[PDB]
Amino acid sequence: ALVSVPDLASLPLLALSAGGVLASSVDYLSLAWDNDLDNLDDFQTGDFLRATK
Amino acid sequence: ENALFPAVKDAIVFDALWQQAHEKVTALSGEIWTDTGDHDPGVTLLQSATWNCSDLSYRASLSLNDLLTHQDQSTLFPEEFGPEQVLTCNTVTAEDYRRALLDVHSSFSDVSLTQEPKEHRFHWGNLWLSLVPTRYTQSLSPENLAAVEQCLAEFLAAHRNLGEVVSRITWLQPATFSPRMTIELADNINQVAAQIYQVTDAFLRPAVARYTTEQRRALGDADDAIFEGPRLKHGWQQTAPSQITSGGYVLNLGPLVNLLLAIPGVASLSTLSVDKGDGHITAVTGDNLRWQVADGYYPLLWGAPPLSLLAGDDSPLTLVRNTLESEAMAGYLTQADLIVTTPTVLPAGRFRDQTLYIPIGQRQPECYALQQPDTVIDDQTRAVHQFLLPVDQLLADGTAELAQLPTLLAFKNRGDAIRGTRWPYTNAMVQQAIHQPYAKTLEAIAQQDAAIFTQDKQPVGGNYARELDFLQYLLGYFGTQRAALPLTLDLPDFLATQRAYLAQQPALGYDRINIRIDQVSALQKRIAARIGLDSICFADNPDLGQLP
Amino acid sequence: GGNYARELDFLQYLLGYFGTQRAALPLTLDLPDFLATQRAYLAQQPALGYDRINIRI
Amino acid sequence: TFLLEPRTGKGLLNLMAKYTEAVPFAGHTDADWKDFWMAGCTLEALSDIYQYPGLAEKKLPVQQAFLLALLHLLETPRAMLNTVPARHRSLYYRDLLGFAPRAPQPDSVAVSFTLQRNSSPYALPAGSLLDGGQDSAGNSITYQTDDSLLITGQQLEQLAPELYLGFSGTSAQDTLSLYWSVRASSALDVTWWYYQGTKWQAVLANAMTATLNVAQAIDDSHFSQPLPANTINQLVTPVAAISDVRQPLPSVGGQPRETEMAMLQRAAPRIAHRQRAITWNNMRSLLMEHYPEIFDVRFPDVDKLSRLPALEVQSLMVIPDGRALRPALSNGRLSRMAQWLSQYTSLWAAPTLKNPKYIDVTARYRVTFVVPDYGYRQLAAQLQHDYMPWATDRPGNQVDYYQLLATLQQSPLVQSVNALVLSHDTGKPTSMETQSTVTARDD
Amino acid sequence: TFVVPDYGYRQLAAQLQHDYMPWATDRPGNQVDYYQLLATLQQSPLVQSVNALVLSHDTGKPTSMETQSTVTARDD
């Protein structure tokens, strides 16, 4: 997917925007594990998150 | 990644947590808080706190190599708490001076250490020593020999147990016992003579095997067997002659399936006829078995390999035919030397840690709050700020304790608290200036209720007890035990005694043996930490302690 | 460079066809005349069977 | 075990009750916010509802239900966080220091192979696939023959020609193969005085025509149980010589894969002592590490250690277990024990080991019973069992008086004790121990 | 000398007798070397250390023996 993050974002919204690129319901806890997030709010308004399946 | 995340992934993902909270409030209340849709405000507050709790749980999974990294230290543990510095190895007190000394050829064989033989006392017991230098007895030591002697002297200074330092060193002179044999071969030169020189030289001194630790654990043993004796900077010994005696010893080879079987190994040569072309070292009666008695001074071979290449050779190699030998065997075809060095163990840290916290009030949608501080809100929109303050700090204490577990489970440098406590807000965040004129007051409440209070201690707050519980649990790693509670000492110096007793565990293994003059003889500080004193007994610089 | 050795390996392997064996390495001859000796010993195998008997002049 | 985070929702609620008093009930004045969370109940009554939710009868103020739901949620990351220090310890023992729970050992049995009625002496090769039951998991364990042998018909007349023994297979080239099952000994020497080309400590048992076996390693769910005479035949049957094959005896040694708790228990003394016998209890621990027969090891007395003739013999008492009552182990092995431990000592140490001395102590009861004579015998056997634990279990050197009182009248058949005068060589309210003896209690 | 009494002499005798008359079982030399028999003996796994291997034909140790009309053999 390679989803960009917007300003004022959140991982349930970043999973809906990654679940529309893949159409596979990408279940936000797997996003923070695949990208090595620290605390579920780690992205900083302009960095990318990679979503596979 | 020992990380818990595929193990707890079906317990931290906010639907399990929300149904656990929702059934909880359905059980506690239930005819007072009847509507639970997403339109009641308290439902939204509780589920936002649930999201922050799930954040806090997700932080508390990954990973054990990542939770424990401090911020800046390269390794999780100090490298002195690694193996071969902890009490797996030792400093030498057995015969192992031998294996303490058979590694210093990098800047020789057969150390013999013993005691004085029931006489030669000082008449009001010490040790004697015995070395053969073989490859230090060279042309490269008419003056370097004295430097090697004083390095041996400071070695013996470095290894001196509780009493009775050694008294005699006994440099041991050669005998140049060089035999003569003839061999015979079939096909293909100057390499077989070099190997015959190597086998006949290595037959004199007994055995020296130096393995890398991964070379040895591939042979099929464990680290409690590998990390046994000295700190070997080179290899790992296992040999136990002691070829040196006191009656000279018969030195003897050479049977059909024994000592003469290490001569036909060279992959060119047939059978032999061996002679002893010298008269200084005697031969016992019986030459078809051929033992050759030495008398307390060690044998060498021919000396130089050009002394193996006279007009009178000592190993003619017939083919049918002169079979001459040049100096090709001496410079090359003869080198079999490697060197081993150990960095003694390193693990690696990561530090994916944090100081970030998001309060509940900015999880909430933009119709309640996030309004600027104490200017626009009207003393009831501040009431929900105070409603969310204990919940925010209870959610923040998990973050605070989480970011102190590498120094709560610390050996050397330990902190001055029991758990973590952090003020959950930041400058350029609205909820600090709203809580401002009591902000210093209440964070002082939660800080003193988590520290151990360095001066006259917490009397009924068992933080002083809980720190000793930490010390008990960590000292239980090293086979030790926390010193008992003094009913008659001061508290803080006893606590500093106990934490310094924890902080030097691998150092406190060595100084039972080998008292160096430049410390407090840490057997003494072992005793001085078994009962709590720590006047000077740690941080070893000053004098005036409790004297033995 | 064991090319001189490898040619003698060829000679050993080919002389092993005819029930013979390459002559051993002289430690005291020249090399090229020995190599020409060995290859000519290979090159006359069927001729070298007859002249045990019937010496022609 | 050790916890790494105490203070549950009771402790959190105590901290929160201390904490919320600092906040004014804003908009209102002279009102603590601690009033808001603690309206209706006290701290302890609210914690009781926290443990048992039914104490609220589906009603309480909803900020308290909110708070208890919060704390029940907060229990979970505390539970993950309490799983840290055990993982820390195992990370330090396994990743660093390379400790590991060591692998198990294979079994060994001896099977007998009696012949047919009359066929021939028949030869078995090594590894003949003897059968030994099924499993604990469900696939057939087999043992293999260690060495090839022949089966001739050698039986065993009592302990006709041998030195101390006899058979019934006396022929030429008898090629007899025995199995012995003997205890530990001191390695005696026998001559076996007969000749074969011309015809004519205690043991457990013997066998004839026997060969030892091993566990053929393919898989496992055992090595915790030795095989109890479980072998009756073998894989594919030779009719040449089987009327039977029996093992008579259990397997020699399994020594199963140790637990992680046992691995930690192996690891912590090995960093207590450096695999060295330097001071006292290096010797005790190192010597109980290697010889399981040793029940305890005691030490010489403190002032005896503090005398000006430094003793230079390093004597230490070893009490065995008999493997009966008041055991004393043979001097033929104690010198070997000292010689074994001496290579892990320092120089100038030379420690020596002693069987203890046994001072039995008597005392009379004069005791009333509940509900006649039988109680004296049962109380005697009970009181004798728990004061010599080297008989069965795994004590003190001294015997206390009033502790023996409170040992006696708590017994369920004992009504009331009257006089417990002790006797050693005589007075009641006393004790007894010396650091050269081991006390014991008769009657 | 032996490792670990008399039995080793018999086993060594049978072993050393087997490999020197290979026409008994297998498919040798006409001569017998001394030091090769040394290195044949002390490599045996029950042999600790050999002391004196004086040969006897008809008498001296460090020798050999063969003629081109006979076949040698080794008893003991």
Automatic annotation (TrEMBL), chain A:
<protein>
    <submittedName>
        <fullName>Afp7</fullName>
    </submittedName>
</protein>
From TrEMBL, chain B:
<protein>
    <submittedName>
        <fullName>Afp12</fullName>
    </submittedName>
</protein>
<keyword id="KW-0614">Plasmid</keyword>
TrEMBL record, chain D:
<protein>
    <submittedName>
        <fullName>Afp11</fullName>
    </submittedName>
</protein>
<keyword id="KW-0614">Plasmid</keyword>
